[model samples]
Target chain A: GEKSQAYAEWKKALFQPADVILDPNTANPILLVSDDQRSLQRADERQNLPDNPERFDWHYCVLGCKSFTSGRHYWEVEVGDRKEWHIGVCQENVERKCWVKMTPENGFWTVGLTDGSKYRALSDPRTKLTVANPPQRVGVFLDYETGEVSFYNAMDGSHIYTFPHTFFSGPLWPVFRILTLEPTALTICPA
Target chain B: GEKSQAYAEWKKALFQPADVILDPNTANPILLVSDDQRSLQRADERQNLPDNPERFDWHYCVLGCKSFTSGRHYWEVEVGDRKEWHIGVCQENVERKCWVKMTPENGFWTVGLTDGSKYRALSDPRTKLTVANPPQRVGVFLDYETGEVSFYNAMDGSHIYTFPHTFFSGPLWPVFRILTLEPTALTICPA
Candidate 1:
């Protein structure tokens, strides 16, 4: 009772809009970022975008334009009624040229929906999450100083999972991946 | 369809009990904190405890034993099906003696169910939230670096509100206040 009361009190104090946006330079050709840079969706055919080192050539991934060096940041994404998508944070220097392992050891901390049904943290061993309902809005909270990345069901503030690590680096970016070819769109919530 | 999917994904990722406990030293004498410090209830009479600056004398409030400075931290409180309660985070230096205004400018940021009917954020200009169901569990998320604290309905991962400021200081504590005299207990969830 007291905790809930306290939580209610604490919840009353914050404000903000989704300050981050998808970086087209970091997006795959098949992953088209909207003009407003607030939404990313699958394209039926790969757009003839520039070929650069920042672009994810093979992996269907894109990164946020903003990067955090020291501080706490939070944002939510509407994963567009899809069953397979990836959301998390990664080091600014994370590999983008070829296939890379989605693990903290490789500078990535994320969770995703796989096989069009199962949910899992893309950790070294890929821990499975037994979720009964599909999540509509996913909240991501990152603490660079604490080296923790947590995901939540934005619809209901439920803890999904947390990845804790020693961040010996600076400037980390939010990363997302949509693997299916169903034109699923991941829209960043403006709250 | 979207809400259910994100909620489902988020519900599956997290595992753990509430990592916070009530600090007895900061609790009001009329409140009895459980041994594990995860639960607090109103006692019939004040206990003969030491009077200190940290203890709440006029309000039935308590602070979490832990404090945050530069990271994202999350915890949930089970409101025990109560209709009236207060929950939120406070600056570590928040006033404890006598009655103080529950506003961010006053070093407090919170939301609560008042009069057993209205849900509002304890901001300078109170914000109203339309919560239909009795929120049995409430979630609090803090991003110290970003100076943001968010509240959510733990039952559905729904966003309630957020307090955003430039936290230009160190050590903010989770603060809770329960006004109801009922035998209701606020228990911290293990996850």
Candidate 2:
């Protein structure tokens, strides 16, 4: 109840509400970033793409175009009825070539719905968390100096998880991943 | 009747159905290109865009990413309920710095709905053509060798206008422009 109230207030003065757009250059070969750049759908076959140094070769992942260095920033994502998806902040230069595990140790701090219903804070060893309801929309609030990246059920202002750590890098980027072989989409909510 | 039948047979053996995407780099500052690059909407305020050589700096227009050198290509655009819009083809290096009249002489061969329901073939002298009904969907069929660029009522295969001329210069690109300032959209029908 306390954190829920905090979430409501946090929703009021969100650091800087960002209109996040998925960056095309960094997406994996199969990740089709929609023309509006707010949504991504995995292609049935590997679509045509130039192999770039910024891409995650072995992972189904994409990063937002805007990278943050300071101040508080907030954004929302619509995962819809997707059974498995990842949402969180990542270091600007996170190692992307190999299949690096998504953890703070690897410069990523995120909350994700793995498998079907389990939500986890991807810290070292990972931590399972409670979710009152399945979140159709997710709010990600990043307070840079205070060293916090909090997740919330944007639909009802319910707190999910907060990663409290001194961030390692100067610039951080919001990252996303999807884990399904069907026709599903993850969309960034417009501001 | 004969032309409608010809359109029906043309649909059966269409030459290279193209998936047209609006080119962002060439779009006007107020023309907002959708992420999938299929549709366009005009923003109320002028947007921040770099002054590029390929852009029509003074015109409210944009071009498709693909250019045709030879053969025939067919694409459709959903004008929806919009009262005013332009659709057709332009040459490879049309002068774009000034407000050039959209005519075949100036390298743009287009059919447009101007000032509500007036459809016209933007030929040298510009001819007012009759549209049987309001076209919610417009089809553009370009046969390069036959020196013909025709427009059809994609909704029911009715003939609209055709520019009969030997096109000058080289490769031609499909172009679009919106005249309405409201929150309306013109979308390229997906292949």
Candidate 3:
């Protein structure tokens, strides 16, 4: 009976809930740093969303030096929208960028770069994810060291674009805002 | 001494001179055939050559069939030439048909269907042939059954294009004057 009790305890430990859940109000937001001193923040190009949210349900941190050297790279985030959402890395401005339409079950997504194209896939099998059409929020994790940005559909474990960090050197928040002609809550993962 | 004499006699039996030197005038000419009641004859386009020393020489057969099943097919030939040359199966007009070029000692040539665009390299390794800037005229031997139109640089056998049946068809000839653009020859081996 004591051995069985111990085993039950071990099972409970293995099944422990997640450490962090994105709470827009209470979540700690990470600061984005650019190679050069520039105002780094998300500016709303669309008229619908407010310039800044009182709280971000999820958060992420930039991983590499702000300037992108010409070569291969990637970034990542967990996108949870299931319908349709256009997710991509941008040059921090309107002109140059590449993105892919994401779905809940889509495996790998790609974005083209100045040098060449980059690839991203999910590492975890259990965590499936999806991008709802007209996403409202998107969660992203940037790994500057590895040159990868991954967008995830964490709810379903679908790995979205593992985009190459091609254009890294622009202003802070190098990625433009996630916009849709229609709207849905496309939440990005909290790091 | 007796053993050496016996060995020498055996070597003599095995040794034989070249079957034919392949003199163009004396070499067997290709017979042209037509689906119509047309007579089998040499290529109608090429004629009026100097008779002195046989400076230019080639044999050709014209098949008068209008069209075969489209899509993909192949034609092949086996022949030898001293000069570098262009050779291969063509439809009514040489400009529209596909053919492989061959050069023996030069190891340089090109081959393709007679599309308006220039011939590009085929993906097959067996069709790995090159195109010299100013193409040369050489002999070609077409083997229809095997679907292999082999281009040889010369009697020495330097370069070749062993096209598959998917790229060719049968009993076709040139309606327009095929200038050989460069001097070349064709030989048809009977099945």
User: How would the docking of model 3 be graded?
Assistant: incorrect
Chain B TM-score for each model? 0.88, 0.93, 0.29
How well does each candidate superpose onto the true structure, as a TM-score?
A: 0.50, 0.48, 0.21
The most accurate candidate by TM-score is 1
Please write out the lDDT profile of model 2 over residues A72-121, one tens digit for every residue. 88999998788888889899878888879888778888888877798877
Angstrom error at residue A72, model 3: 15
Off by over 4 Å in 2: A1-191, B1-8
Which 10-residue span in candidate 2 chain B carries the lowest summed lDDT? B158-167
Instruction: Quote the lDDT for B12 in model 1.
Output: 39
Taking the tens digit of each residue's C-alpha lDDT, what string does model 1 give over B59-159?
78899887876666778889866778888888877778878888888788788887778888786667666554567888887767556676777765555
Ranking by TM-score: 1, 2, 3
Candidate 2's residue-wise lDDT over B1-106, tens digit each?
5335545555545467888999999998888999999999988877888898998788888999999988878999999888789999999888888888888778
Winner on DockQ between 1 and 3 is 1
